[PDB]
Amino acid sequence: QNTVILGSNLPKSLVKQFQKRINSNGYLEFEVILRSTFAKDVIYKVDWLDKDGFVLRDVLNEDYQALRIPAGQEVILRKLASDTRANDFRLEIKAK
Ligand SMILES: [Br-]
Numbered sequence: 001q002n003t004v005i006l007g008s009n010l011p012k013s014l015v016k017q018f019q020k021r022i023n024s025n026g027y028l029e030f031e032v033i034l035r036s037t038f039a040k041d042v043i044y045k046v047d048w049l050d051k052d053g054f055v056l057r058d059v060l061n062e063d064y065q066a067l068r069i070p071a072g073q074e075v076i077l078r079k080l081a082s083d084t085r086a087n088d089f090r091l092e093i094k095a096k
Contacts, residue, residue: 004032007094011036016074020089028081030089039071041096046079048086055090059083066096 004015016033023029028048043064048056060082069075079089 003089004091004093007092009095010040010042010093014069014093018091022087023080026084028086028089030079030091032077032091034069034075034077035072036069037072040069042067042069042093043096044077044094045092047090047092048081048083049088049090050085051087053088056083056085059086 004018006012006014014034014036016035018030018032020028020030043066045064046062048059050056067075067077077091081089
């Protein structure tokens with residue numbers, strides 16, 4: 001919502017659903033399910049958020065990542081925080 005931010009060249013219905021949980025080591029993991037009628041190459045970026053909703057700026061961040069979404073196949077994007085202070089996330093997705 002304000003959790004997954006899609007660029008103007010992606011369909012609004014790209015994101016099927018998302019969810020998160022804290023795993024049994026104490027780290028937040030999220031799963032975003034994507035699907036598209038046509039094959040699309042996209043580029044995504046993750047921000048981890050703390051208990052107040054502030055960006056955690058002192059954790060190792062991953063660079064922009066490419067992702068291939070095959071035509072009509074469900075794609076499950078799964079990410080795991082590296083810091084226990086992460087309690088939420090923000091995901092940007094744009095067309096390659
Ligand atoms: Br875009």
